[PDB]
C-alpha cells in the first residue's frame, strides 16, 4: 500500500518582539501646595481655668 509520509512541517519566522499590555498606572508628577492655616480660637477665661 501507498501510505503517506511525514507532514510538511511548520515554517517558523524567527524575529524579535515587544509585548505591550494595557496601562493601568496613573500618570504621576510633582506638584506644590501653597496654603495658610488660619486658626482663630475663642477662649473663655474663668476664675481658675481657661
Amino acid at each position: 500500500r501507498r501510505c503517506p509520509t511525514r507532514p510538511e512541517g511548520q515554517n517558523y519566522t524567527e524575529g524579535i518582539a515587544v509585548v505591550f499590555k494595557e496601562n493601568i498606572a496613573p500618570y504621576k508628577f510633582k506638584a506644590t501646595m501653597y496654603y495658610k492655616d488660619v486658626t482663630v480660637s475663642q477662649v473663655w477665661f474663668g476664675h481658675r481655668y481657661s
Binding site: 486658626t39 480660637s41 477662649v43 481655668y49 481657661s50
Partner: protein, 50 residues
C-alpha cells in the same frame, strides 16, 4: 438656634486611666488637656468635678 458646636477629642491622662478607670471603674467629669499649645479645661454640665 445653635450658633456653633465646638467638638473636640481630649486624651485621658495616665493618672486618670490607672487611678480612676482601671482602679475604680469611674472617669472624671472634667477634661483637662493641652490643645493648641494651651491648657484647656472643660467641666461637664458646667458643674463641679465628679
Amino acid at each position: 438656634q445653635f450658633m456653633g458646636i465646638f467638638e473636640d477629642r481630649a486624651p485621658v491622662p495616665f493618672e486618670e486611666v490607672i487611678d480612676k478607670i482601671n482602679a475604680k471603674g469611674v472617669c472624671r467629669s472634667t477634661a483637662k488637656y493641652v490643645r493648641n499649645n494651651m491648657e484647656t479645661t472643660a467641666f461637664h454640665r458646667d458643674d463641679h468635678e465628679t
